[PDB]
C-alpha cells in the first residue's frame, strides 16, 4: 500500500480522498500553508499601513467587499464589528483593490484621514511596492465612474495621474499602456467578469469603487468575481454602520488581516488536539427533550467561527465550483481533505462531556464538506442517519432521464434518485424554460442532529447540503460523503411546467409518485418490490401535493404494527383518510374530484365561486420528514414538518401538523389564542370519519365539552358576561392553554349545521363552506363580490391580522357563520366571550335575520355525535345532561 503522505499528495490534485485517513498529517500540511500565507500577508500589510491612520468610515450607504480564496485575497480594512470594508486581490498573479464605497470622492472630506494610506495602496497597485513613487502623469483609465471626480480623488491623495483617455476594460491596447484601471458600476461590456479577470491576469492593476450605496450591483458583483472577491450580503453596511476608528493600531489591523479566512488558532487547536474540557455544560437548557447550549460561555463564539469556515466553503458549493479544478486553491483543498480524513475516523455516538476531543473535532469537520468534485470519500459510519444499506446501494452506469413537474412558482421537489456515499454523480438540467434551478441533497432540518443531548451526537450536523446552482444544459459532478435524496430547487417557474433531469451514477431509492386520477397500480407494485428488496435506508412518497421523505425502517415499522404488512391499504389510507380528507375539508380544487352535492347546492344557492383554480387552487407541496429525530420535540411544525414515530395515516399528529399549514387568520378566534385550536378540525374530522368508516375510536376525549361548559356558566355570572367567560377561556396566553375547551367552540357549529340540514352526515360541511367563503373574502374583487359574501356594508376588504388583540378573526367567523346559517349568531358568540367589532355587528344587523338564542351542544365523547345534547342557554344555564 502507498503511504498516507503519498495518498494526500495524489488526493490534492484530483480530490480523491477515498484512501485518506491520517487527519493529523493533513492538518500539519494545512498549518504549514496557513503560516506561509500569514507571513506573506503580514509583509504586504506592514508595507501598506506603515504607521498611518487606519481611520476609515464608509457610512451606512456602502457595501461590504469580501475576500474569497484565502491564498490570493485578503482584507484591507476590517471594521470594529468585523465587517470587511475593503479587500485586496492578487488573483491570477495580478494586483487589485476593491472598496465598498467610492472612497475617491471622500479623500478631501469625510475620509481625509485615509488619503495617505490610499496613496500607498495605489503605489502598491501601480508598482507592486507600496513605497515606490508613481511617475508624474502616470496613465489612469477610468471606466464606469466619473473620470474627473476619480482623478481629482487621486490628486487629493498626493498622486499626479493623467487621464489615459481610453477604456482599458474593453480596449486591450489601452490596457497595455495604462498604469491603472479605476472601475465603478457604470461599466458596459460583454463578458464583464471574464474580461476583468483577463486584464488582471495580463497585469493591468485595478481599483474598484462600489458606486451604489448599500444597494447591490449586478455589475459590481461581476467585477468583484473577476478580481476573486465577492459582494457583501443584502443591505450592505446600513444596519451595522461599521467603520475603522482612529484608535485602531497597525498591529491590530495586521493581526486581523493575517488571520482572516484561515482561523489560525483553530488550525493550531486541530493539530494539537487541544480541545476544551471545561465548558460549563450545567448552563445547557432542555426544551421538550431538546438540549441546547447557547448560554454555555464560549460555545457560541466557537460555533460562529466554525460557521465562517462553512460559509466560505459553501460559497463554492453553491456556485457549482470544483475547488479541485481551480488553480491556486491549496488552503481550501487542504481544509476539505482534512475533513474527509476526519470522516474516516468518526465513531458514534459521542457525548459533549465524555468525548470532548472527538466531539469538538467532529463538530468542525461536519461543517467542511466539498460537494462539487469528480471523486471523494464516503464517511465510514453514518450513525443514526443510515447504514450498510445506503453504503452499498447500486448505482446506474448510464444516463437516466426523468421528467419533473414543478407544481408552484418556487420550492423544491424530489427528483426520485439518491447520491450514493462517495460515488461520483453527474446531473444536468434541460428544458428549464424560465425556471432557475439548483440541486440539493436531503431535507433534514439542523435541529434534528441532537448533538447537545447526552450521547446523541450520532449523525452529521449538516445532512442537508447547500443548494447547488444548475445552469441549463451544463453538467455538474457531485460526490457526497453521506449519500442523500436528490431534491430539485426552483424559483421563477411557471406552475405546472416540466423540467428534464439527466443524471448518471445515482442510486434508486424506493419511490412512489401518485397523481390524482391515473393508474398507480404499477407504481405501487414497483414500490412494494423495492421495499421488499430491503436495499435502502431512505425512501420517498409523492402523493398529490404531499412529499414524504422518510427513513425506511420508520415506515415499515408503521406498516407492520398498524397495517399488518398490508402496504396497499397503507397507501390508500395515506391518500384518502389523511391527505384527501384534510384538503377536501378545506374545500380545495382537487383534480377529477367534484364537490359533494350538499356543498355544490349551498354554493350555487349563494352564487359563490367554489371551483375556480384561481381562488381555490391547491397550495404548494407540503413536505414531511419521517426520521429518527426532529427539529424540535418528537415532531416540529413547518414545511417540511418532522415526525419521529413513523407515519400513521390515522394518526392525530399527522393531521394536526398538516392542519397548521392550512390555518388562515380569518378563521381563528382571538388570533394566536386559536393557534393550536383552529387547525384541530382536521384531526377531529378524521377521527369522526374513522369511527364511522372503520369502527375505530381514536382520541375520544380531546374535546372537553364538560369543562368548557363549566368555564361558560361561571363567566356569564359576571356583570359583563362576555368579558367574564372570556378571561376564563381565551385570556390565557399559554400556547396550549385550555386547548380542549377552546376546541369545543369549533365543533359547536358542526352539531349546529348537522341539525340545520337535518342530516347527521353534513355537519362538517360548515367548515368547508367557511373555508370557501374565507378564500373569496381574501382574494375576490372586493366591489364586485362583497354583496354575495355578506360584506356589503364594508367599503374595504376586512383585515387579516393574526394578533390576539384583533377582531379580524372573530368578525369573519361571526359574519360567515351568520351569513351561512341565515341566523344572527351574536348570542352564542357572547356566550363564549368572543368580542366582535362594531362594523361586524353592523353587518350582522343588516342581515335582518332572526336571532339564534344562545345555545350549547354537549357530549360525553368526542367522535360519536349520536349522543350530543342541545342546551337552550337563553334563560339561564341548564344542568349537565349526563348521566
Amino acid at each position: 500500500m502507498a503511504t498516507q503522505e503519498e495518498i494526500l499528495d495524489a488526493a490534492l490534485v484530483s480530490g480523491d480522498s477515498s484512501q485518506l485517513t491520517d487527519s493529523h498529517l493533513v492538518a500539519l500540511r494545512l498549518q504549514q500553508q496557513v503560516e506561509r500565507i500569514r507571513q506573506t500577508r503580514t509583509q504586504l500589510l506592514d508595507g501598506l499601513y506603515q504607521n498611518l491612520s487606519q481611520a476609515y468610515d464608509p457610512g451606512a450607504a456602502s457595501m461590504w467587499v469580501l475576500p474569497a480564496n484565502p491564498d490570493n485575497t485578503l482584507p484591507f480594512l476590517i471594521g470594529d464589528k468585523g465587517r470587511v470594508l475593503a479587500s485586496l486581490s492578487l488573483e491570477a498573479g495580478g494586483r487589485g483593490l476593491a472598496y465598498g464605497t467610492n472612497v475617491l470622492t471622500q479623500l478631501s472630506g469625510t475620509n481625509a484621514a485615509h488619503a495617505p494610506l490610499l496613496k500607498r495602496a495605489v503605489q502598491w497597485l501601480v508598482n507592486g511596492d507600496p513605497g515606490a513613487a508613481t511617475a508624474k502623469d502616470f496613465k489612469v483609465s477610468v471606466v464606469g465612474v466619473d473620470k474627473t471626480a476619480a482623478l481629482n480623488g487621486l490628486k487629493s491623495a498626493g498622486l499626479q495621474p493623467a487621464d489615459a483617455a481610453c477604456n482599458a476594460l474593453t480596449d486591450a491596447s489601452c490596457a497595455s499602456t495604462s498604469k491603472l484601471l479605476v472601475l465603478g458600476n457604470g461599466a458596459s461590456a460583454a463578458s464583464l467578469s471574464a474580461t476583468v479577470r483577463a486584464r488582471l491576469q495580463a497585469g493591468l492593476p485595478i481599483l474598484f469603487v462600489h458606486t451604489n450605496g448599500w444597494n447591490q450591483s449586478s455589475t459590481g458583483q461581476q467585477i468583484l468575481a473577476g478580481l476573486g472577491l465577492q459582494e457583501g450580503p443584502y443591505g450592505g453596511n446600513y444596519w451595522d454602520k461599521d467603520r475603522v476608528p482612529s484608535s485602531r493600531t497597525r498591529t491590530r489591523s495586521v493581526e486581523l488581516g493575517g488571520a482572516y479566512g484561515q482561523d489560525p488558532a483553530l488550525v493550531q487547536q486541530i493539530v494539537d488536539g487541544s480541545w476544551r474540557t471545561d465548558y460549563d455544560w450545567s448552563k445547557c437548557t432542555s426544551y421538550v427533550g431538546r438540549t441546547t447550549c447557547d448560554d454555555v460561555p464560549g460555545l457560541s463564539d466557537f460555533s460562529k467561527r466554525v460557521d465562517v469556515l462553512k460559509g466560505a466553503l459553501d460559497a463554492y458549493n453553491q456556485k457549482a465550483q470544483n475547488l479541485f479544478a481551480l488553480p491556486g486553491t491549496t488552503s481550501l483543498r487542504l481544509w476539505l481533505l482534512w475533513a474527509d480524513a476526519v470522516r474516516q475516523n468518526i465513531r458514534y455516538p459521542m457525548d459533549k462531556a465524555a468525548d470532548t476531543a472527538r466531539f469538538q473535532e467532529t463538530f468542525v469537520a461536519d461543517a467542511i464538506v466539498g460537494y462539487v468534485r469528480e471523486a471523494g470519500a464516503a464517511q465510514k459510519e453514518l450513525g443514526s442517519y443510515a447504514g450498510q444499506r445506503q453504503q452499498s446501494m447500486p448505482v446506474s452506469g448510464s444516463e437516466e432521464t426523468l421528467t419533473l413537474t414543478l407544481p408552484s412558482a418556487q420550492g423544491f421537489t424530489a427528483i426520485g434518485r439518491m447520491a450514493a456515499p462517495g460515488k461520483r454523480l453527474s446531473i444536468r438540467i434541460e428544458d428549464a424554460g424560465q425556471a432557475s434551478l439548483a440541486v440539493g441533497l436531503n431535507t433534514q432540518r439542523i435541529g434534528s442532529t441532537r448533538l447537545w443531548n447526552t450521547r446523541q451526537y450520532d449523525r452529521p450536523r449538516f445532512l442537508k447540503s447547500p443548494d447547488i446552482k444548475l445552469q441549463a444544459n451544463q453538467s455538474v459532478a457531485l460526490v457526497s460523503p453521506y449519500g442523500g435524496l436528490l431534491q430539485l430547487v426552483y424559483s421563477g417557474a411557471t406552475p405546472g411546467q416540466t423540467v428534464t433531469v439527466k443524471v448518471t451514477g445515482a442510486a434508486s431509492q424506493p419511490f412512489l409518485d401518485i397523481q390524482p386520477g391515473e393508474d398507480s397500480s404499477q407504481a405501487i407494485a414497483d414500490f412494494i418490490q423495492a421495499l421488499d428488496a430491503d436495499k435502502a435506508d431512505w425512501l420517498e412518497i409523492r402523493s398529490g401535493s404531499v412529499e414524504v421523505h422518510a427513513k425506511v425502517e420508520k415506515v415499515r415499522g408503521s406498516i407492520d404494527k398498524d397495517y399488518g404488512g398490508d402496504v396497499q391499504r397503507f397507501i390508500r389510507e395515506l391518500n384518502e383518510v389523511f391527505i384527501d380528507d384534510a384538503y377536501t375539508l378545506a374545500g380545495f380544487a382537487i383534480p377529477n374530484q367534484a364537490k359533494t352535492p350538499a356543498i355544490q347546492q349551498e354554493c350555487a344557492a349563494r352564487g359563490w365561486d367554489c371551483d375556480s383554480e384561481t381562488l381555490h387552487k391547491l397550495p404548494g407541496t407540503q413536505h414531511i420528514n419521517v426520521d429518527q429525530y426532529a427539529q424540535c420535540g418528537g415532531g416540529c411544525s413547518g414545511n417540511p414538518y418532522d415526525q419521529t414515530w413513523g407515519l400513521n395515516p390515522r394518526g392525530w399528529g399527522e393531521s394536526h401538523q398538516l392542519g397548521h399549514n392550512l390555518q388562515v387568520n380569518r378563521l381563528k378566534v382571538y388570533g394566536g389564542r386559536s393557534g393550536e385550536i383552529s387547525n384541530q378540525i382536521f384531526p377531529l374530522h378524521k377521527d369522526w370519519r374513522v369511527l364511522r368508516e372503520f369502527g375505530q375510536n381514536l382520541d375520544d376525549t380531546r374535546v372537553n365539552y364538560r369543562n368548557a361548559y363549566n368555564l361558560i356558566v361561571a363567566g356569564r355570572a359576571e356583570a359583563d358576561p362576555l368579558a367574564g367567560v372570556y378571561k376564563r377561556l381565551w385570556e390565557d396566553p399559554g400556547t396550549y392553554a385550555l386547548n380542549g375547551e377552546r376546541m369545543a367552540f369549533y365543533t359547536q357549529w358542526v352539531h349546529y349545521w348537522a341539525d340545520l340540514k337535518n342530516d347527521p352526515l353534513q355537519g362538517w360541511d360548515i367548515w368547508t363552506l367557511l373555508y370557501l367563503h374565507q378564500r373569496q373574502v381574501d382574494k375576490s374583487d372586493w366591489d364586485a363580490n362583497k354583496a354575495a359574501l355578506g360584506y356589503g356594508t364594508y367599503a374595504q376588504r376586512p383585515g387579516n391580522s393574526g394578533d390576539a388583540s384583533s377582531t379580524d378573526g372573530n368578525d369573519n367567523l361571526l359574519l360567515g357563520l351568520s351569513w351561512l346559517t341565515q341566523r344572527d349568531q351574536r348570542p352564542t358568540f357572547a356566550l363564549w366571550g368572543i368580542r366582535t367589532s362594531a362594523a361586524a355587528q353592523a353587518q350582522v344587523a343588516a342581515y335582518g335575520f332572526a336571532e339564534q338564542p344562545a345555545f350549547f351542544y354537549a357530549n360525553n365523547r368526542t367522535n360519536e355525535y349520536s349522543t350530543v345534547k342541545l342546551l337552550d342557554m337563553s334563560q339561564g344555564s341548564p344542568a349537565w345532561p349526563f348521566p
Binding site: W214, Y238, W239
Partner: peptide, 5 residues
C-alpha cells in the same frame, strides 16, 4: 431608501 429588515 432603506433595506427591509
Amino acid at each position: 431608501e432603506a433595506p427591509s429588515a
